[PDB]
Amino acid sequence: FLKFVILHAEDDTDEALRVQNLLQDDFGIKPGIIFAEMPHGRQHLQNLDDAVNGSAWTILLLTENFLRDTWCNFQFYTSLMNSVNRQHKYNSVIPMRPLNNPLPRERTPFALQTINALEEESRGFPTQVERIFQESVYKT
């Protein structure tokens, strides 16, 4: 049971590695994995479920590639899960804008605008990260 899984469009795998290294090395949040490192071959629809159920948090690397390639599948997955069980996924979902090619706010889909995102450009980001990944939340 990992702490975080970074969902990321295939073309952003370099940024997903960088954010993983940032969280693991600079903030000590371990262990963590990137969606690209997940069992390959395994169908996308499912290994999404394996990823989201496999970690205490899931991080959305918000980019225009992510919006084009991966958002609709995840919104459909989460909304379907939320419609059939009480473990409503978004309480564990963290949208993040990275330093490189972030998805603008005015292009972020409204469902994710309901969540206080993580902005890597913000000087509050270290404090936000500390708030989210506090160890007392890592339960079950």
Task: Identify residues after which the chain is interrupted (C–N over 2.5 A).
Answer: none
Cis amide leading into 31 (omega within 30):
yes
Q: How far apart are CA 10 and CA 4, in angstroms?
A: 18
Experimental technique for the deposited model? X-ray
Number of structural domains found in the chain: 1
Q: Is 75 left (phi over 0), alpha (psi -120 to 50) or beta?
A: alpha
The CATH code of the domain that includes 52 is: 3.40.50.10140
Query: Could you tell me which residues come within 8 angstroms of residue 104 by beta carbon, excluding any fewer than 6 positions away?
Result: none
94 forms bridges with which residues in the sheet?
Answer: 59
Task: For residue 87, give the DSSP letter.
Answer: S
- Answer yes or no: is 139 within a domain: no
Cβ atoms within 10 Å, residue 120? 18
**Angle made by CA atoms 121, 71, 5, in degrees to the nearest 5:** 65
Query: Could you tell me which residues come within 8 angstroms of residue 120 by beta carbon, excluding any fewer than 6 positions away?
Result: 19, 22, 96, 97, 98, 99, 102
- Answer yes or no: is 140 within a domain: no
Q: Which domain holds residue 40?
A: 2-134
